[PDB]
Amino acid sequence: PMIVFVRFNSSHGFPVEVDSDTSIFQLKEVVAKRQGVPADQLRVIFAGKELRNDWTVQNCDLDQQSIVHIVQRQSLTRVDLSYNSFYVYCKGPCQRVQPGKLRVQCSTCRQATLTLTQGPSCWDDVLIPNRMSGECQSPHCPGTSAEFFFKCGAHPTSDKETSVALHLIATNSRNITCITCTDVRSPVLVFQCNSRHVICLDCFHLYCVTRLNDRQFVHDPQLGYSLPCVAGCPNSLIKELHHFRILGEEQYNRYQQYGAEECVLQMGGVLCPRPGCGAGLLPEPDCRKVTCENGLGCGFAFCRECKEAYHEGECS
């Protein structure tokens, strides 16, 4: 036996115990009795698809305590974008990289009632907004645009309990050796250089930690603060910066802080030199007098060039 959560026309999810071999029609019957409606007017929507009455729960790839939407009047469970599953960063309760689930909602009413016209065939289809289309089966919604989302697969997750997809991470099903340690591990991160160099998560973490602490991350105005392929290949900066979640919580926050500092500096700004401040400031380019100014700054007025208290004339 297993439990399936049912959201009945956007209602709060109630559990239904089923068997692996329970048919969708049987599930429609019990929900029908509970809601006082005829079963023939029910439609079951899951993972971007309407489930047919003759399918069984296990045939529909319904995991334990997942959620189906029921409305009135290729499955995303089997998609492979490139076991070879997807991975997310689960911020809680796992606080780690975990195998993920690909799901989809209506981009206009934000409910998982949109059925896809076609399934996604590449990461771009699920990562680029509005790339895929469908019909929101909600009674009063004219939504036609799909909004994909990801959930951690290591425990049950509510409908809005989403996690960021780390689309460079792949199951190492073919035992590719790590470019840096030469060992075989799973999963691995695949850089988007021409060579598609593969690195294990142990070495990727150490790569990130050592480069962060040495201020060797790279600032790119279009992408942010990132790192390229460990082998130095060109045009290989990581674009989805949540991959640096592999740093762990403390170092990830230090990464975000350093990245913002570097962003200020690249925009031609200055970091306030007063001890205990360090506020990021963007004065006029021609301006030598910089004042760290309702509750954000420390009030220090300093010379942009020598970083001492503002002074007339040449520095020193």
Binding site: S226, G280, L296
Partner: protein, 76 residues
């Protein structure tokens, strides 16, 4: 959902947002809390300057994540 906005001093503000909120909405919320006019705010996530027309979901910004705030000085 809850997100945090921090200056580079570590000063922290908390906002209630939706993933579909634009960066301009986020700046209006910051102005509502701290009085900083939006024209002086620059928001940064993971080192990337955030654009007024984009949404939090456009940057995959998650519940409880942090944006960094730096200030444009117009006086200077």
């Amino acid at each position: 959902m809850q997100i945090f906005v921090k200056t580079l001093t570590g000063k922290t503000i908390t906002l209630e947002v939706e993933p579909s909120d634009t960066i301009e909405n986020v700046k209006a919320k910051i102005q509502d809390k701290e009085g900083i006019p939006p024209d002086q705010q620059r928001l940064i996530f993971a080192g990337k300057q955030l654009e007024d027309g984009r949404t939090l979901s456009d940057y995959n910004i998650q519940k409880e994540s942090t944006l960094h705030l730096v200030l444009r000085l117009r006086g200077x």
